[PDB]
Amino acid sequence: TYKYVNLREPSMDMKSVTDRAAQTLLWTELIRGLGMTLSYLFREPATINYPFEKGPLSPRFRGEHALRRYPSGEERCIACKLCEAVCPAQAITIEAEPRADGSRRTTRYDIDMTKCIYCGFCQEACPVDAIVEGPNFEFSTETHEELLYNKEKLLNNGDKWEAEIAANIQADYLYR
Amino acid sequence: SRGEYVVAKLDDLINWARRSSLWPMTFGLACCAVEMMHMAAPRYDMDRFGVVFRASPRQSDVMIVAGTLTNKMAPALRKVYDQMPEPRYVVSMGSCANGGGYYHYSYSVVRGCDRIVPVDIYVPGCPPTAEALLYGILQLQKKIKREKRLRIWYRR
Amino acid sequence: MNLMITLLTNFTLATLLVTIAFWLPQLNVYSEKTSPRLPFSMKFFLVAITFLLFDLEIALLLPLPWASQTTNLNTMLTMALLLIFLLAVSLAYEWTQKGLEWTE
Amino acid sequence: VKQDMPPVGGYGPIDYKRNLPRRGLSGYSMFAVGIGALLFGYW
Amino acid sequence: MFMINVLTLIIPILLAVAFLTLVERKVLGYMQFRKGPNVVGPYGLLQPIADAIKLFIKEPLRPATSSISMFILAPILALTLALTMWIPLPMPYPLINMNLGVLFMLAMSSLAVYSILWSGWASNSKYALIGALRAVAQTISYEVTLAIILLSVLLMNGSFTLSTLIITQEQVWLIFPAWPLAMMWFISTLAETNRAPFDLTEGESELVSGFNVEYAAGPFALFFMAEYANIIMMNIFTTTLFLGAFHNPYMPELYTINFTIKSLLLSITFLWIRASYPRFRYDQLMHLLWKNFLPLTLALCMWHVSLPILLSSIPPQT
Numbered sequence: 016t017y018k019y020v021n022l023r024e025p026s027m028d029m030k031s032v033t034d035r036a037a038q039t040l041l042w043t044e045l046i047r048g049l050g051m052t053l054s055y056l057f058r059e060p061a062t063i064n065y066p067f068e069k070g071p072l073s074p075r076f077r078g079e080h081a082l083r084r085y086p087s088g089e090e091r092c093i094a095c096k097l098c099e100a101v102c103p104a105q106a107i108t109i110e111a112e113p114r115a116d117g118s119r120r121t122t123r124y125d126i127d128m129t130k131c132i133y134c135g136f137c138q139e140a141c142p143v144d145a146i147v148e149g150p151n152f153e154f155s156t157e158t159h160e161e162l163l164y165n166k167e168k169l170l171n172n173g174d175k176w177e178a179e180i181a182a183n184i185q186a187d188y189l190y191r
Numbered sequence: 192s193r194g195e196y197v198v199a200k201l202d203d204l205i206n207w208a209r210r211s212s213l214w215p216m217t218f219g220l221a222c223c224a225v226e227m228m229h230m231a232a233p234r235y236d237m238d239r240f241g242v243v244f245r246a247s248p249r250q251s252d253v254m255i256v257a258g259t260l261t262n263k264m265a266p267a268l269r270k271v272y273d274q275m276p277e278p279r280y281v282v283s284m285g286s287c288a289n290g291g292g293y294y295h296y297s298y299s300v301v302r303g304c305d306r307i308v309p310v311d312i313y314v315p316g317c318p319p320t321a322e323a324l325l326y327g328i329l330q331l332q333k334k335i336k337r338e339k340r341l342r343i344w345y346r347r
Numbered sequence: 348m349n350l351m352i353t354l355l356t357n358f359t360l361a362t363l364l365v366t367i368a369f370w371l372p373q374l375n376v377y378s379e380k381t382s383p384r385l386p387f388s389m390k391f392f393l394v395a396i397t398f399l400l401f402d403l404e405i406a407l408l409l410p411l412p413w414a415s416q417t418t419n420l421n422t423m424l425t426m427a428l429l430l431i432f433l434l435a436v437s438l439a440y441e442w443t444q445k446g447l448e449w450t451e
Numbered sequence: 452v453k454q455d456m457p458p459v460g461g462y463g464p465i466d467y468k469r470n471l472p473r474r475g476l477s478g479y480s481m482f483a484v485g486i487g488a489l490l491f492g493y494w
Numbered sequence: 495m496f497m498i499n500v501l502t503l504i505i506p507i508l509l510a511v512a513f514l515t516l517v518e519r520k521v522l523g524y525m526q527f528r529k530g531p532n533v534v535g536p537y538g539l540l541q542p543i544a545d546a547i548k549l550f551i552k553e554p555l556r557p558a559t560s561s562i563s564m565f566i567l568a569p570i571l572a573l574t575l576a577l578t579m580w581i582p583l584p585m586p587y588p589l590i591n592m593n594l595g596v597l598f599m600l601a602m603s604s605l606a607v608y609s610i611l612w613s614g615w616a617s618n619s620k621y622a623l624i625g626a627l628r629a630v631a632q633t634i635s636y637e638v639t640l641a642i643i644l645l646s647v648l649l650m651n652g653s654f655t656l657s658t659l660i661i662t663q664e665q666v667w668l669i670f671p672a673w674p675l676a677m678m679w680f681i682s683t684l685a686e687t688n689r690a691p692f693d694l695t696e697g698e699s700e701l702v703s704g705f706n707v708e709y710a711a712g713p714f715a716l717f718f719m720a721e722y723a724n725i726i727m728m729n730i731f732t733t734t735l736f737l738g739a740f741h742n743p744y745m746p747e748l749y750t751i752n753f754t755i756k757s758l759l760l761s762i763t764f765l766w767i768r769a770s771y772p773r774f775r776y777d778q779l780m781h782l783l784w785k786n787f788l789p790l791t792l793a794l795c796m797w798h799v800s801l802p803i804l805l806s807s808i809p810p811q812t
């Protein structure tokens with residue numbers, strides 16, 4: 016249940032001593048290393064052609080956040096504040112009131128994406144699949160406050176990415 | 192006229208040269224170092240864009256702040272930024288360099304490196320993937336591509 | 348003459364490259380930046396002196412490809428092997444008296 | 452039930468040991484080749 | 495007409511130095527299982543141009559220098575010596591055909607350490623000076639075996655004339671009578687140009703290459719292109735010295751094609767050595783010189799003195 020790395024006493028007969036002296040004087044392991052580097056010279060490189068090729072992702076991927084809707088246009092978030100209760104960065108800020116038809120909806124739904132640790136606890140805490148974390152990772156900004164998302168940005172991300180978000184949830188909801 | 196055309200083509204030449212030969216200095220402070228090292232790994236391979244891996248910090252173009260900036264390494268960050276030759280850019284990688292991140296309310300963390308240095312590109316994630324950082328590097332290249340240094344020089 | 352022309356041309360191209368590389372990046376007006384004995388080692392000096400003395404021994408060895416053409420070949424071969432042997436004896440005394448240590 | 456499982460016979464054998472396959476000539480042979488190249492050059 | 499010949503030497507030297515950076519980044523890319531540059535030009539062919547234009551409009555870094563005069567003269571001397579090492583190279587005809595081209599190149603390469611020494615003086619940091627003195631001690635250490643290997647090989651040539659060294663190798667490559675000299679030559683020229691695994695300035699084992707150190711240094715492109723001129727030149731010199739090609743005096747282009755292909759293979763061998771090994775520690779390459787290469791070099795020097803005498807193969811002076 017254990018093995019000894021580097022507990023080999025070398026053979027001291029003239030054959031092995033001449034082997035090690037030929038290794039010293041004729042640089043045999045150095046030519047071995049040159050041969051291994053030369054072997055990688057003639058391989059096809061592992062380089063993908065970004066942006067025209069994309070790295071492989073799964074339907075579980077945790078990228079940009081989005082607020083979703085039912086298949087009626089009604090937004091799924093019913094202001095229950097589980098996602099900011101579980102948010103380990105406290106990146107989520109929610110206010111709420113009954114809207115004009117008496118429905119429990121949010122007035123504020125902020126996610127500071129620069130506090131956010133992208134761990135998907137909000138999408139697993141959400142009882143109505145409202146907040147999800149979409150597949151978008153190509154959303155670098157040029158200013159810090161463009162990453163301080165309010166509810167309108169998250170609803171636009173939901174409307175923007177729903178055709179993909181719904182298919183990824185369709186692929187992964189039986190594991191959840 | 193003619194001079195506007197000449198300074199426009201010279202802007203195009205120098206912007207092409209500066210964006211297509213970006214040399215990054217990386218503050219590999221924390222976990223985002225691992226993902227920049229994947230952005231230099233053979234799949235994504237920053238070096239095929241002209242973006243050499245392990246450039247000298249003395250002659251670097253962009254400072255990639257990849258990790259959590261603490262209060263104890265904020266003056267070293269600013270010192271390395273002050274030793275950079277212009278034109279210098281700063282890519283803030285990841286949530287702790289952007290805005291404090293998971294350690295935003297800590298006693299010992301600078302809430303985003305933009306309290307210390309001017310930031311050009313904010314790359315979001317914890318960590319952002321190596322593909323997302325390469326997206327931010329290409330957005331920095333596009334930002335350099337639309338610079339107008341000689342056109343604004345000519346119009347002043 | 349052609350050698351002097353070539354040396355002047357190489358010196359001129361080098362000075363032109365240096366003058367361009369110092370004055371061409373001064374075209375763009377930059378933001379004027381306003382923010383803000385060495386220890387001796389005996390081994391560093393000893394490797395330089397060992398270089399100098401073996402380089403003088405090499406200066407003795409450099410006329411050998413002309414010295415093989417002589418008619419006094421036995422004397423020439425004796426003194427050639429003797430200079431290379433004295434270089435080797437200088438190296439052996441540098442070895443055994445701890446002279447090649449920590450810059451071995 | 453449909454779960455991520457190994458197949459019926461299990462997976463195949465996975466190598467995990469060092470394979471540095473001992474290529475090259477012998478120590479006598481490499482010095483012989485070098486001395487032969489020297490003697491051909493000298494001749 | 496002669497100035498045309500000087501310029502058609504020295505301008506393609508600079509163009510070859512430009513595209514050696516591309517060849518380095520590509521060949522080191524594919525050996526590292528990735529690609530080199532392929533975006534900036536078609537197959538990366540605009541990468542040296544873009545990189546040179548970037549380096550020539552970049553600000554002088556932060557600091558000031560201890561001595562203005564040596565801060566100016568070190569890149570001037572580095573580029574001047576890097577360009578004058580090419581003028582006696584017989585390819586098949588040297589630009590300056592001199593009787594002592596070998597000794598000229600040995601002397602002008604011995605003069606090249608003053609650029610390193612004066613750039614160490616011209617920096618303000620007392621640690622960059624220590625790094626420069628380590629580099630100077632390395633280069634002057636391997637110049638010893640350069641001189642003695644070069645002498646031992648020229649004992650089969652008959653003279654210091656570089657053009658005679660084509661005539662010497664008309665029957666066989668000179669690597670066949672002198673392959674231990676050839677391999678210690680190749681590794682010693684590798685250790686001359688501060689090239690990996692001997693690059694201690696550009697790597698670790700260094701007291702000053704340590705991230706947010708001082709030391710105003712020169713414009714990097716000039717020392718860099720002097721260094722790559724030296725790399726291509728020492729590989730062409732090794733090609734002339736040990737792997738000399740067939741020369742038809744009515745068709746010089748055959749020799750030029752042949753030595754060019756061999757020099758490209760030998761420069762790619764430099765690229766392939768730097769992408770294969772870790773670095774020496776400083777005392778380990780001092781060990782490799784003083785305790786390993788120099789005893790074999792003195793022994794083979796005695797051998798190559800006494801060997802044309804015992805074989806009756808003393809080469810002619812003319």
Ligand SMILES: CCCCCCCCCCCCCCCCCC(=O)OC[C@H](COP(=O)([O-])OCC[N+](C)(C)C)OC(=O)CCCCCCCCCCCCCCCCC
Pocket residue numbers: 039040041042045046049482669674676677678680681691732736767771782785786787790
């Ligand atoms: C010109 C074209 C290219 C030429 C060939 C070069 C291409 C190959 C390059 C490979 C990569 C090398 C990268 C750098 C490597 C540096 C490290 C290294 O190799 O160190 C050298 C090593 C150093 O030794 P070491 O460190 O490996 O071993 C330990 C050393 N001690 C014990 C001191 C601690 O070996 C040498 O110095 C060998 C030098 C050349 C040997 C020439 C052998 C001549 C044999 C003659 C016959 C001998 C038989 C007995 C006598 C018979 C008489 C009839």
Ligand SMILES: CCCCCCCCCCCCCCCCCC(=O)OC[C@H](COP(=O)(O)OCCN)OC(=O)CCCCCCCCCCCCCCCCC
Pocket residue numbers: 196197200201203204207336512533534540542543546547
């Ligand atoms: C009076 C008229 C003249 C006025 C003054 C101008 C003088 C001439 C200056 C050069 C030409 C000016 C224009 C420069 C390029 C502008 C266009 C451009 O940038 O096109 C982009 C295109 C690549 O597209 P990209 O945005 O990189 O996309 C990523 C890949 N999908 O880019 C490309 O396809 C490649 C662009 C190459 C740029 C030109 C080639 C390099 C410059 C050579 C000359 C200068 C240097 C000489 C040698 C110096 C030492 C080596």
Ligand SMILES: CCCCCCCCCCCCCCCCCC(=O)OC[C@H](COP(=O)(O)OCCN)OC(=O)CCCCCCCCCCCCCCCCC
Pocket residue numbers: 509535536539540543
């Ligand atoms: C000894 C041999 C030495 C060899 C040295 C050179 C090696 C590389 C050789 C060149 C390889 C191909 C280069 C192609 C560069 C890109 C050309 C091009 O079309 O760039 C596109 C860019 C923008 O074009 P745009 O009008 O926007 O097009 C939109 C289309 N609807 O258009 C532009 O930017 C404008 C056109 C720029 C063209 C630049 C071409 C390369 C110039 C390199 C300088 C050296 C030239 C050779 C000198 C030595 C030989 C004589």
Ligand SMILES: CCCCCCCCCCCCCCCCCC(=O)OC[C@H](COP(=O)(O)OCCN)OC(=O)CCCCCCCCCCCCCCCCC
Pocket residue numbers: 348350351354358567570571574575578591592593594595598
């Ligand atoms: C910091 C200062 C600036 C630094 C940068 C610039 C200086 C450093 C780089 C330049 C070094 C110059 C070296 C030139 C001489 C080399 C030796 C030499 O002349 O060898 C060539 C040749 C010998 O061969 P051979 O065939 O025997 O003679 C011709 C007879 N058939 O002999 C000939 O062909 C003889 C030709 C006539 C004599 C030529 C004399 C040249 C001018 C005087 C020396 C100039 C350099 C002074 C400064 C050196 C560095 C400080």
Ligand SMILES: CCCCCCCCCCC1=C(C)C(=O)C(OC)=C(OC)C1=O
Pocket residue numbers: 214243245246247511512515518519542545546549696715718719
């Ligand atoms: C006149 C032509 C000038 C071309 C300049 C190219 C400079 C080399 C670019 C890449 C590079 C390499 C290969 C390199 O080896 C190196 O040293 C470690 C760099 O500095 C950090 C580099 O940036």
Ligand code: SF4
Pocket residue numbers: 098101102103104105106107126130131132133134135136137138148
């Ligand atoms: S992914 Fe995690 S850190 Fe980000 S908003 Fe959701 S719960 Fe908060």
Ligand code: SF4
Pocket residue numbers: 091092093094095096097098099109137140141142143144145146
């Ligand atoms: S957990 Fe879901 S429904 Fe509840 S407040 Fe958050 S997003 Fe809205």
Ligand code: SF4
Pocket residue numbers: 221222223224257258259284285286287288292293316317318319
């Ligand atoms: S933003 Fe997150 S993953 Fe990235 S370095 Fe910071 S703690 Fe690590």
